[PDB]
Amino acid sequence: DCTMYICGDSTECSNLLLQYGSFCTQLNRALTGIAVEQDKNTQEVFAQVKQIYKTPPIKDFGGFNFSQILPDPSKPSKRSFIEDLLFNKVTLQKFNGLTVLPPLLTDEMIAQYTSALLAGTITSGWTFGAGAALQIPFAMQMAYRFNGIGVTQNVLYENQKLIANQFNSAIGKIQDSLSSTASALGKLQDVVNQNAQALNTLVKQLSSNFGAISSVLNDILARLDKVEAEVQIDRLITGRLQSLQTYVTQQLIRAAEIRASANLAATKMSECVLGQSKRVDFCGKGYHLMSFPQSAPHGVVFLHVTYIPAQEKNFTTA
Amino acid sequence: LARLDKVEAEVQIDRLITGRLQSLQTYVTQQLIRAAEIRASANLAATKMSECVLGQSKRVDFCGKGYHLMSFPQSAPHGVVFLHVTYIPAQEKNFTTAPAICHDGKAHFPREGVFVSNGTHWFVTQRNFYEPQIITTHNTFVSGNCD
Amino acid sequence: DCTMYICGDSTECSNLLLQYGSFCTQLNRALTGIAVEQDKNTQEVFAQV
Amino acid sequence: ETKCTLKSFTVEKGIYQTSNFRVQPTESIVRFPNITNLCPFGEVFNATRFASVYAWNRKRISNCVADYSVLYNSASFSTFKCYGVSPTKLNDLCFTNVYADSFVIRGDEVRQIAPGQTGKIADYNYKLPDDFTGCVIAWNSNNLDSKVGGNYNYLYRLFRKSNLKPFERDISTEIYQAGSTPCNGVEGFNCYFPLQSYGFQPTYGVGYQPYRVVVLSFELLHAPATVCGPKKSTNLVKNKCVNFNFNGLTGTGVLTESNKKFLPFQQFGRDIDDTTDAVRDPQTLEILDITPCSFGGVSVITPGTNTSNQVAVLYQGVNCTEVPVSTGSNVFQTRAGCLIGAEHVNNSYECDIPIGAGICASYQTSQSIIAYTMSLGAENSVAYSNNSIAIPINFTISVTTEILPVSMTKTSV
Amino acid sequence: AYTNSFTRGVYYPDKVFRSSVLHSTQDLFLPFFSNVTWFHFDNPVLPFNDGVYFASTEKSNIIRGWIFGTTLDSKTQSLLIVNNATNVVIKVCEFQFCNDPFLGESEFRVYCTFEYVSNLREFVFKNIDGYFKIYSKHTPLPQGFSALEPLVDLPIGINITRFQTLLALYYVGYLQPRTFLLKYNENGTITDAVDCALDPLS
Ligand SMILES: *[C@@H]1O[C@H](CO[C@@H]2O[C@@H](C)[C@@H](O)[C@@H](O)[C@@H]2O)[C@@H](O[C@@H]2O[C@H](CO)[C@@H](O)[C@H](O)[C@H]2NC(C)=O)[C@H](O)[C@H]1NC(C)=O
Ligand SMILES: *[C@@H]1O[C@H](CO)[C@@H](O[C@@H]2O[C@H](CO)[C@@H](O)[C@H](O)[C@H]2NC(C)=O)[C@H](O)[C@H]1NC(C)=O
Ligand SMILES: *[C@@H]1O[C@H](CO)[C@@H](O[C@@H]2O[C@H](CO)[C@@H](O)[C@H](O)[C@H]2NC(C)=O)[C@H](O)[C@H]1NC(C)=O
Ligand SMILES: *[C@@H]1O[C@H](CO)[C@@H](O[C@@H]2O[C@H](CO)[C@@H](O)[C@H](O)[C@H]2NC(C)=O)[C@H](O)[C@H]1NC(C)=O
Ligand SMILES: *[C@@H]1O[C@H](CO)[C@@H](O[C@@H]2O[C@H](CO)[C@@H](O)[C@H](O)[C@H]2NC(C)=O)[C@H](O)[C@H]1NC(C)=O
Ligand SMILES: *[C@@H]1O[C@H](CO)[C@@H](O[C@@H]2O[C@H](CO)[C@@H](O)[C@H](O)[C@H]2NC(C)=O)[C@H](O)[C@H]1NC(C)=O
Ligand SMILES: *[C@@H]1O[C@H](CO)[C@@H](O[C@@H]2O[C@H](CO)[C@@H](O)[C@H](O)[C@H]2NC(C)=O)[C@H](O)[C@H]1NC(C)=O
Ligand SMILES: *[C@@H]1O[C@H](CO)[C@@H](O[C@@H]2O[C@H](CO)[C@@H](O)[C@H](O)[C@H]2NC(C)=O)[C@H](O)[C@H]1NC(C)=O
Ligand SMILES: *[C@@H]1O[C@H](CO)[C@@H](O[C@@H]2O[C@H](CO)[C@@H](O)[C@H](O)[C@H]2NC(C)=O)[C@H](O)[C@H]1NC(C)=O
Ligand SMILES: *[C@@H]1O[C@H](CO)[C@@H](O)[C@H](O)[C@H]1NC(C)=O
Ligand SMILES: *[C@@H]1O[C@H](CO)[C@@H](O)[C@H](O)[C@H]1NC(C)=O
Ligand SMILES: *[C@@H]1O[C@H](CO)[C@@H](O)[C@H](O)[C@H]1NC(C)=O
Ligand SMILES: *[C@@H]1O[C@H](CO)[C@@H](O)[C@H](O)[C@H]1NC(C)=O
Ligand SMILES: *[C@@H]1O[C@H](CO)[C@@H](O)[C@H](O)[C@H]1NC(C)=O
């Protein structure tokens, strides 16, 4: 609330602030534009699927064990288990006129969307992303994933137990890592920190003098004659306005750099999750097979399953 | 300038100069940020022109929902429009399916397609359009025994 | 070096620039972020292998 | 208000943050200690015997709280001049030290008790400086300082070699010499004892009647204060938006309970934001939290004006029990804010107008602006099983239209 | 003699409750690991500098007060502080202080516009803006940490350049303008500090 950050309750200040015109309208309207784009980002990333596919209770996914990745009904938000690890690992109105608008999609609804994208993926492969969902046994769509990388599908079927046991183990390596280490989610944590640290600057700037005889505007109202009082207030508001303008500008820059990450996450959703990507190292190192999204706080985590050659043997060729 | 002497007209005008300079540098900055947004839509519009129009894209849900056949560009003021023609599967039917067919101890897998049963008789058919074919030595390949 | 650019050698100016508070800490930290980003970009593009 | 703030007579469907609202302060509270050292003015005004003006008394008043209104509002004073200070704002001002001076004089002599005055009292008994800061307070004392046969307790200096400096005193009794004839310590021609006594019989005219005077001299200096005017206080209120002043810490907020244990010397409490989190009541010594009076953007939710003139209102953040009582009957508490006029329904739809925290609003059925939790989409059971495949029998050739910006109006200023 | 002050000599810089917070304050503080002078019955006159840290370790209350001023004689007003056997006593006067001030409480042999009347013992004395500000704590010079609470402020406005103790028939350090980062717990007591100039990690 630009008028409240700058002037507070002072009518005497508010009668000066009107002489600066529509700076407070710009500062309000820019921040509301940043605010709206946060909902656009979250919709564009997650709401790529128009029918909420229920997870089938049969859970006969060819020996693959998605129990970490699929929802847990024992949790009130019905997050997955890895979604709950991520939620915990991103650790963290006022007199100054700041207020913290909530997002449009709750932390449940984005977890319902990830569950829809995931339950569609494992039951119907790519097909739900580009038409009606076509059910297929998971062993067979995996053999399509294998055939897509150019490993003949029999190499899946003849090794299905080994492939399933490798994958199930690798999900354990994720869960253990995201449990134990602190440093993985730094890419989310940095954005959380920068927004908090930007406000801690914005509020502490209220203690600056900017050349005024006091930083507490209530002093001047009580202690100076009207002409000198208004001059000393004009000193403060010129500084507090330029303090608030510096905040809004850097929030415009951050919102553009997050918009560029929302667009990328929406493309990884479209191409890694709803599909299979031939684009090298786009959907993780190795050849891409399939990816599973998980809704970290104000972010997304893609579990890229990839095929990596091993035990290279020399041969003569012609 | 009509009303005040220079030595203090300078002081009044210095306020307007500061305010109008601060007004203008705020507009210029917000145009630099908007330009950095349109530049990213112009880089994406150029990329969709190269990849959807000049080509065919296998990037899922890049050139529209469905499987991308082709697209046609159309101009619009300050922008561009893409008409994305796409194949969408429709009116799906259930079939029983198998990973492999066994005969004479040999395991057969499809070359290009998938095995389906009509409830009585087994066929190979392509993934994206129901088109049943007899299972033959020229549309399957052997690998390993049936165990 | 924000206080060196604005006030130079002078303590008498520095004692006034401190009345503008965090303003030089913002500018030192913003440039530091851009400076680190240049290392990130070049590690990202070349050190893929 | 939307039409005004968008500056248009037509409005497209949406939510518009037309203004902000704040809970107003209901009253102003003041708090200061109720145990204090009152300045002892009584013993300088109501002393039984005053000084002779040649030997005018002085008393230091310091380390105390005054209330000069008790003096100035009294009707008994016949004269109450102040110099460099106003008798009213005297009660708002504060001083390092004060000197109270007192003496008895003739009623005709009160006019000599002013800065820059001359004459026997001003020149030879009590001199005020040219830049005197104080007040002169005087009253008739013919009820006390006169008697039948005359009262000769009081004296004044009639002769001196030179005028007194400001606030100088001279009690010397050496016989004054008015001429070339030496006095040799005895009175005579040109040879006079320097003091004379007033003829205070009670029957005299007012100019000859005795008057008591108290002069208060105020030391405005760079030294610390020790004599302030009254540290007033009001009754104390809680859980209401009020203006407050605690020991000079002054602001506006909801005073409320606390369990934060201040150390015994501490008076004020601050958050991580250099802003008042709590304060000690200087009277009860209770700790109060201070919380801001609730405020938010107020947002008007509208269909297109082509569809209706009816609108709902969302008060961002605030609780419906706090929202001011503009005419809407329906009230609902979203987690985004108190929503008024809109009607809660148990259906769900695509998000027509977004509010926040999953709530959306729409103009629907006789029409009203309904408010609902948004539908994510149709709900579907995907019919997976370990041996079934679905294959399309048919196909649809879509044409999907996509639009991208490319340029914006080339401009230069 | 001389000894290391370690992290002694922090005191609450303002009368403000702060809790669960780290706060940076700039004030006259005793620098960390400062070399403080150490004494055992000589009672010399010592300079006051910009401000003083004083402490003593005792089991018999032999130290009994201090005197502060410039001339330390009746040519100027001086400050007397004495913990007598029944009261702490404070006076400002043009004291003609003795050549060897001591108590004995049969004997008083120490020598007006202000007066006031009220183990390891630690004290800090400041004389700024005409306030003589006193901080203290009593603790059951050892390496460790605690913060001195404000004892009293005297609005006396006098000039001070040197001081001396009162003994009945200790350690001295000096403050410097330092930035300290102070840590407040949930009970709003200071529990740690960083002298920002001490070393590059600090
Ligand atoms: C495809 O069939 C399924 C039913 O399951 C299959 O068919 C059975 C006859 C049996 O052979 C099973 O082993 C197969 O797996 C249909 O799914 C059901 O559809 C109805 C609505 O018609 C719905 O109420 C049920 O909940 C669905 N079952 C599940 C598990 O979700 C499906 O409709 C058929 N699809 C097509 C295109 O024919
Ligand atoms: C999938 O894997 C998980 C382990 O990653 C299995 O969960 C464990 O199940 C056993 C019982 O079989 C429990 O005692 C453990 O407590 C479970 N783990 C945890 C972390 O709670 C799960 O059973 C596996 N499911 C299938 C079908 O293989
Ligand atoms: C291919 O590699 C896998 C490991 O990635 C091998 O599987 C392991 O084989 C050893 C015995 O050689 C077992 O002890 C492990 O338990 C196996 N792992 C799993 C997950 O089952 C596999 O044998 C290798 N195949 C070849 C032909 O070398
Ligand atoms: C499954 O498909 C086969 C075709 O391959 C159907 O069998 C044919 O049925 C027709 C009569 O409807 C006969 O004229 C053909 O000779 C049959 N061919 C064979 C190889 O038997 C069969 O009826 C289909 N089953 C269902 C349930 O539709
Ligand atoms: C809206 O305001 C009311 C008070 O007017 C809140 O009621 C209190 O809620 C707390 C729990 O949050 C209880 O401990 C109190 O006992 C309640 N007070 C009364 C008088 O019942 C209410 O919870 C608020 N609701 C929201 C959503 O903010
Ligand atoms: C596939 O769908 C198309 C429509 O999208 C069907 O074509 C229509 O068929 C009806 C008769 O069933 C005709 O009356 C219409 O004129 C046809 N449309 C056009 C544009 O000619 C087609 O028959 C469907 N095929 C299958 C196998 O389901
Ligand atoms: C307080 O008064 C003393 C003298 O009574 C001043 O101290 C002298 O200062 C000069 C330097 O200006 C030195 O050369 C003398 O040795 C000092 N004498 C003593 C006895 O200390 C002191 O400067 C005054 N302080 C203030 C703040 O005015
Ligand atoms: C310690 O000092 C106080 C004064 O600060 C002494 O108290 C005075 O004692 C005399 C009798 O000796 C009384 O006449 C005074 O009225 C007392 N003054 C106050 C303010 O109470 C006290 O006696 C001293 N103690 C010792 C042991 O000498
Ligand atoms: C802060 O103060 C509280 C009391 O105001 C202390 O809490 C007590 O702590 C002891 C253990 O040290 C417990 O046995 C008591 O039950 C606690 N009381 C309450 C009411 O919780 C606390 O220890 C203090 N902490 C610090 C760091 O000073
Ligand atoms: C003197 O006494 C009267 C009552 O006899 C009292 O009202 C007045 O306040 C006293 N003087 C002062 C200065 O208080
Ligand atoms: C001071 O006022 C408070 C109430 O404001 C009261 O509790 C307290 O007892 C008062 N003190 C005295 C000495 O009357
Ligand atoms: C609504 O819009 C149509 C546009 O054709 C116009 O004709 C009509 O008068 C409008 N009605 C109102 C009430 O604005
Ligand atoms: C609508 O939901 C509320 C709970 O929010 C419930 O009390 C009410 O009975 C429901 N009414 C209908 C008709 O479902
Ligand atoms: C402390 O300083 C004195 C000089 O002021 C010096 O003689 C002594 O050696 C120093 N002690 C230590 C431990 O540094």
Author numbering:
A (entry chain B): 737 to 828, 853 to 1078
B (entry chain A): 981 to 1127
C (entry chain C): 737 to 785
D (entry chain A): 298 to 622, 637 to 676, 689 to 736
E (entry chain B): 27 to 66, 79 to 142, 154 to 160, 166 to 172, 188 to 209, 216 to 244, 265 to 297
The authors write:
S glycoprotein trimers protrude out from the viral membrane and are the major proteins on the viral surface, making it the main target for vaccine design. Sequential cleavage of S at the S1/S2 site followed by the S2’ site within the S2 domain exposes the fusion peptide (FP), which mediates host-viral membrane fusion, allowing entry of the viral genome into the host cell. Overall, the S-trimer structures are similar to those previously determined for B.1 in situ, and are similar across all variants.
In the open form of Alpha, residues 852–855 and the 630 loops are generally in the positions observed in the Alpha closed form. In addition, the A570D mutation leads to a new salt bridge formation between K854 and D570 in the Alpha variant in both closed (B) and open (D) states. In contrast to the closed conformation, in the open conformation of Alpha, chain A H1118 continues to have two conformers, with a slightly stronger “down” conformation, while H1118 in chain B and chain C are now primarily in the upwards conformation. The density assigned to Zn2+ is present, but weaker, in the open conformation. The downward-facing H1118 (chain A) is accompanied by rotations of R1091 in chains A relative to the closed conformation, while R1091 in chain B has not moved.
